[PDB]
Amino acid sequence: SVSKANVPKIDVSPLFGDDQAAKMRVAQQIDAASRDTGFFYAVNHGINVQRLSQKTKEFHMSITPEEKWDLAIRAYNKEHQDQVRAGYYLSIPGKKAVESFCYLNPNFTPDHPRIQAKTPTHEVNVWPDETKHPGFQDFAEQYYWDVFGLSSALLKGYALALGKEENFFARHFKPDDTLASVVLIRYPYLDPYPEAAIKTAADGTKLSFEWHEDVSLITVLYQSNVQNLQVETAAGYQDIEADDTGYLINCGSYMAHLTNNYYKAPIERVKWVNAERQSLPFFVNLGYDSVIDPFDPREPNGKSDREPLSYGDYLQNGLVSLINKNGQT
Numbered sequence: 488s489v490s491k492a493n494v495p496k497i498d499v500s501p502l503f504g505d506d507q508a509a510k511m512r513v514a515q516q517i518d519a520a521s522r523d524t525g526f527f528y529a530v531n532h533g534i535n536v537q538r539l540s541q542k543t544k545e546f547h548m549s550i551t552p553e554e555k556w557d558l559a560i561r562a563y564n565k566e567h568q569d570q571v572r573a574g575y576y577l578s579i580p581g582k583k584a585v586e587s588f589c590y591l592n593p594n595f596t597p598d599h600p601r602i603q604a605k606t607p608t609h610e611v612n613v614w615p616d617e618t619k620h621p622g623f624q625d626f627a628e629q630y631y632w633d634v635f636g637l638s639s640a641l642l643k644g645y646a647l648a649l650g651k652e653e654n655f656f657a658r659h660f661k662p663d664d665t666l667a668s669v670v671l672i673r674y675p676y677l678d679p680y681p682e683a684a685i686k687t688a689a690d691g692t693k694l695s696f697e698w699h700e701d702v703s704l705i706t707v708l709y710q711s712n713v714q715n716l717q718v719e720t721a722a723g724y725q726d727i728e729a730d731d732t733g734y735l736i737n738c739g740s741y742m743a744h745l746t747n748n749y750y751k752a753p754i755e756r757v758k759w760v761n762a763e764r765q766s767l768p769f770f771v772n773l774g775y776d777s778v779i780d781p782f783d784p785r786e787p788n789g790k791s792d793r794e795p796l797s798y799g800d801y802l803q804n805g806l807v808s809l810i811n812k813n814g815q816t
């Protein structure tokens with residue numbers, strides 16, 4: 488029936504250090520994984536993922552219907568026209584099981600020039616009442632910077648893996664302008680589970696979210712210990728093993744663009760599982776004006792004829808296209 492994807496566990500801790508040869512050995516493993524199924528687990532990453540899943544659980548289970556409307560993105564609340572990305576994504580009982588909360592760069596404030604200029608994809612985060620969710624905002628903002636630091640190191644590994652200097656990507660990944668987002672996703676246990684919330688794939692598999700390529704440079708994902716993800720290969724979809732201690736890493740379609748598809752953006756989908764679980768992606772996005780010059784590591788001269796793509800326009804297009812294809816989450 489369904490085979491299992493080879494998803495190696497890569498000790499990424501050398502990427503935080505100054506042992507350059509050890510960094511290269513990590514880079515080789517990243518290269519191999521990126522050329523195989525496109526996924527690896529980053530282990531020995533230094534993030535307290537036990538507290539992450541705890542603080543997230545407390546929030547999802549304690550937020551009330553009134554608070555969800557008050558935080559809701561524009562897709563669920565016409566009063567909130569500035570909330571395209573950040574805020575609460577409501578479930579629809581009987582129809583849509585998943586619900587989630589998305590937040591962006593905490594440095595996006597009314598003082599920020601991109602907020603002042605009303606540049607697309609930049610928004611000021613919305614937060615629940617502190618007294619109703621003590622410590623939640625503090626946890627969430629600190630987590631953003633914790634995973635930012637992990638992601639910076641991973642980007643050093645990807646750069647070395649492609650034959651570049653280690654800051655080739657990370658130099659565009661900055662706290663003052665990153666469009667990176669965290670999404671705290673709840674997938675509920677439901678009895679009965681509404682069939683309307685289950686999609687059926689071409690191959691018959693029941694899904695919660697259909698196939699797609701990630702809109703990101705890379706995706707840095709923590710999930711609770713419930714197997715659900717699949718990656719498409721030429722021989723069909725393969726199950727990605729769960730690992731609630733590691734971070735599941737893959738390239739997004741911006742990486743595929745700039746490498747001339749040498750590191751493809753894998754096609755992934757989410758199987759339907761009737762189980763309470765958490766999915767907490769960090770989408771590594773660059774700045775709105777960031778441009779990486781494409782190259783082709785397959786060619787002796789490394790030359791690509793692909794257009795340099797401004798990251799902001801890429802992100803705007805990608806997020807709207809994904810909603811159109813796979814629905815409003």
Ligand SMILES: CC(C)[C@@H](NC(=O)[C@H](CS)NC(=O)CCC[C@H](N)C(=O)O)C(=O)O
Binds near residue numbers: 572701702708809
């Ligand atoms: C597969 C997981 C990463 C997760 N899927 C997801 O997060 C899916 C597919 S990558 N991503 C999205 O819908 C895009 C969210 C973008 C976010 N609101 C933003 O403004 O930056 C899931 O569990 O459904």
Ligand SMILES: [Fe+3]
Binds near residue numbers: 699701
């Ligand atoms: Fe995805």
